[model samples]
Target chain A: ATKAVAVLKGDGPVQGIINFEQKESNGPVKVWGSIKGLTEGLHGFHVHEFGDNTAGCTSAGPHFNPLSRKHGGPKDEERHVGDLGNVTADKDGVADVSIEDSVISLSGDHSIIGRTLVVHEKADDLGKGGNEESTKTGNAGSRLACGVIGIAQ
Target chain B: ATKAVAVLKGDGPVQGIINFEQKESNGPVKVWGSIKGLTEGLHGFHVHEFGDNTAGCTSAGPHFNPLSRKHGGPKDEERHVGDLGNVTADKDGVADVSIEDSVISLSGDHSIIGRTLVVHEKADDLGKGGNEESTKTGNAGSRLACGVIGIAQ
Candidate 1:
């Protein structure tokens, strides 16, 4: 299987590592990672439009939605291509999460490598919240951490 | 004070505002700013070697030390010209710090204009830690947010 990784970074206690792997070159992706320096609560997480970290994490831009879909949960059909799910941190401010996604590919137009991964300061409301920001970014607040997706050994 | 400004941006909770000013055109600079998307603790902050944000924060290069000196606190004479010390955040995760630094100038060779300001993900050890990275970058982890210093009205 081919694999990729990203090491999230930000000012203060908002950091972590992420991994992505696919069995086939054109197969679905399996993601796993452990994040540190988080609050004991849910935080919004997703892949971003770009991998540029020049201006820190903002250079990564918005979510990586190639299909131009609205924001939703990972299981929702109408969602940004980068949508994953909430990462719940423990009392020690650590979050360990794993996800299996079909919409994202290891290669091709939907390839997430060379993109960005962003963790938000606020919890994602997910599209079900029926709020205006929900359809846009699930009302995720500021960017807490970011990293570039890179080829893994 | 002759004011200069830097607007910081990054993915997730990495957005912030930074300001620098010199009491005299060639005097010590007063560094101050209100930063957001950070933990309520200490974070390493400095003026990087470059102002280029084309490739993200890393493109800015190492610390901005005009004199060939070791990394030290703002008050230390044997320190990087850009070493400004740490900024502390409140419980709200907001860092509003103002420090008067003698090492920086608004104009001339030591002038910090057109440089880069980086807020790191970890705390700076003030070069007291007996480690190689500490002498280099104070062992401060990732660049969370960054902005280019520009002239302000």
Candidate 2:
């Protein structure tokens, strides 16, 4: 049971823990987290490229798109592995997310370790909200929180 | 051990975890951490006044000096609980610190929950280094890393 964890840090009311657990089977990396300080709506979350925190969340670079695929949701066949999709929050500004994805892995080419995790200020359109930015960043607004993925001991 | 954990995050090359535990007998909180990416020297570490990271670490306010005591080292009988002093890193830019303090507690007037823990860019002078800045902040430069304390389940 290999595990990876990210402890989010950022401005505003957004911060918490995100966990990634590799399972025995070839299932998706089990992703779960309890994040706080969000508007009562949808927010974009993704695994970023660089792990450097020398700046803020911006230092993590763009999404971890090793496949050079189009911007799409998690289940899309030709989408980026980092595209885990939206994290919905309640009226209390909290997001409790638990998702199993097939694209992500703890080993192989798409391993998410040694990368940065980012929570955006707005909802990701999943490339279907009718906008040019939707094909790109999903227009997720500013990065509300940033954390580096590391092996859990 | 029952512990409270905080995951330090911010700019620069510093990152890691800080832990505080309560003993069975009457004792101060046992504080410790395993940090990396620090310079090979002394760095000031303290509990800040606020848990708010809405605007980076500076928003956490000054040290958690609830007793209104003068700034002094952790060993001094008359000192702020926030004045835990400096943490030295090895040549590999790593710091593994452990200390037992009498003034800090998990439950009481010195309760440090919901507070911020910060690692500074410079060393704390212990208020005897012969300078006004030494008394104020030990001339600890800028905040390198910041984390908020939370009850560990």
Candidate 3:
């Protein structure tokens, strides 16, 4: 098995650690993490294209869309490889993330290592917002926190 | 054995890939990489404290000085663990880096995973410049590029 992790942080008080695991190459990936200091609700989550943060989360670039696909839910066939939908936060302002997806890989062509994992300030519309931004970013508001994905034990 | 890698990028034309390898836990780490689009001279190289680049390389924080040590050359007995000295570039503006150090580990308390690897714009004085910034940053100039170190196969 292979694993990766990201220690997320932002300008504000948001902080978290996200872990990724795969039993085999090109296998389904399990994503899990805990983020704190978020509003009590769902927040958009996705993988951005670059690990370069020379300008903060904005420089991380857009969603990891190697396939040039549209924005959608994690389970949608027309979604970008980076799209994983939303992570729900509790009243205590903590989001315990747990997700399973087949598109994102730790190795091979679709590898997401060295990329950026971002937590947004608003819920992802999942391309149902019926607007131009929805297809590009799910109409998710500004980025709240982000971290670069790195190899792990 | 464990391995890690970082894909570096900057605001300018600088781009490169650095690889880290270790044969055992807390073993000496082997660092190698190739960076292009740099001036023909030595450039400072070190791992910053955080993987967070929310404000570009500046937000990556200072050198990985877990022991609260002073800055010095890579071979100096008294130096920060992140201090790896300078990498020389060829006339074509390409630097082929090769280094070995026992202080920076891939797995342990001193593990550098998820930290930021920064390439500087000026040559490092190796704490011999006889100035305050020299002992703090080896007098390395502005960051030319940076990337987060991640786990690798």
Candidate 4:
């Protein structure tokens, strides 16, 4: 059940942001969140399609490719709708992540609600932790903080 | 496109409490989360099926089953699976709350990991704002703030 819910408090550079607006037809209609204070480990999570929260998220886009697809990982079918693959944070920084798009639709046709959420300090290797889709799920390195899931004011 | 993945993170007090696991046919794993600082407005969230994040969220359990089954809202199939509905904070208090469980799992039958994220100062009349039972999203009051989703220590 996804209704009109949006919350993102903690944007020092990018630490919190959320948007939930799909409530049927399977679930998940719009959920773009953020949290990256990373000094720890594991990163890589995307919803990027553009919302431009700017700060480090690079303005959010080029990851939620819609049907432009081709990034891989999050299970990969060919991947690249902003392949949500990694997220870890130990040392005590805290990095929790989530993703569910089913093509996104807030209230109309294919709506990503404004899209934007990026965080990657390293490890997304879907391009391969080093590059070339190592196996898919690692080419993630640097971006570290961004939020724009829209409707937040 | 529904691969399989699950993870959890927590620090305690009120810093961070992450979660992911919930895609194993949606069974006996029903963990829910909310409150980055109250989303936008009508706070008061719940899952309290019992977990006990150290009285931080009040032992977690209670209000996950008021039962009605069909009135509408929160995906309304007639609704009633604990329906923790009612969240509308977005100027940066974000709320994209979602939880479902024939059981709850993301990969290894997770029981919701550590559980705890309570925030409420009023608003949850799922009974339909008519008095209570708008179907059962009610009970949105008091508690203010709490976090405990667990896994990363």
Q: lDDT values of the candidates?
A: 0.69, 0.67, 0.74, 0.45
Worst 10 residues of 1 chain B by lDDT: B106-115
Q: How far is candidate 4 from the true structure (C-alpha RMSD, Å)?
A: 13.4
The count of residue-pair clashes in candidate 3 stands at 5
lDDT of 1 by residue, B1-153 (tens): 166666666555766676677767656677778888888778878877655454556666777455757677764667787776677877776888688777677554444554567888778887877687667678778888776544342
Instruction: Give stretches of model 2 more than 4 Å off.
Output: A129-132, B1-41, B44-153
lDDT of 4 by residue, A1-153 (tens): 233322222334335434454667456654543354565777766655544331224433456464654666666676766567776776666666556666556434544443444666676766544454433324675565543332211
CAPRI-style grade of the A/B interface in model 4: incorrect
Give TM-scores for every candidate, taking all chains together and pairing residue i with residue i: 0.50, 0.53, 0.57, 0.33
Please report the candidate that would top DockQ against the real structure.
3
lDDT of 2 by residue, A1-153 (tens): 266566675765677567677775376678887778777787878876655444556756666466766667664665566776688888887888898776677645444554667878788877766576666557787778876554442
The per-residue C-alpha lDDT of model 2 at residue A79 equals 59
- Stronger candidate by TM-score (2 vs 3): 3
Residues B1-153, candidate 3: write the lDDT tens digits: 176666666655676567788877756788877877878888878876666555556667766466766778666787887787788988876999878777777765555666778888888888888887777678888888877864544
lDDT-wise, the better of 1 and 4 is 1
Quality of candidate 4 docking, DockQ: 0.08
lDDT of 2 at A57: 65
TM-score winner:
3
Between the candidate structures 2 and 4, which one is better when assessed by DockQ?
Answer: 4
Give the per-residue lDDT of model 4 (tens digit) for B95-137: 5555554523332323232233455556666555554444443
